[PDB]
């Protein structure tokens, strides 16, 4: 069937752009945690 | 000196640009959700 | 057995809500960016 | 107000997202799940 191999390309493009959702979260995390320690420098500063 | 806020201020811009990305991707996801209902959608027609 | 097909609607219905909820969380937490944003722009206006 | 209260909204802003942006990172990580068993209904689709 054409159906079923359409299916596997879009499961497949599905993975891919999920997982780079997940990667660019994760990144978000961590910048979040920067801002934790930029905050942390501003109270530090006086 | 203001190297703590100038840091702040390209994380801000930083997380602005990746959670564009963020969203954008996950919009594409939703399509591609509804595209593959589409397919089940177009098996039980066939 | 034309229980795949059942099943396969079953997990594209979950995953269009769990993605959707996936976007309006992304799209708080642009605003609170921008809410970050002017944060820092009210911390310049301060030390300067 | 005082740059000692910015930096108040800036910790409970930084914390906000933070806890949000883990949810949006738990979703994908279910999502990504289930797109496996989705991978899991094409093969047992085309056995038949």
Known sequence: ????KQMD?????????????????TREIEQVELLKRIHDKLVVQS
């Not at 069937?1 to 079923?4: M, P």
């Not at 390309?9 to 979260?25: A, F, G, P, S, W």
Request: net charge negative.
């Open 9 to 25: 390309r879009v499961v497949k493009e599905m993975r891919r752009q999920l997982e780079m959702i997940d990667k660019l979260t």
């Open 1 to 4: 069937d054409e159906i079923e």
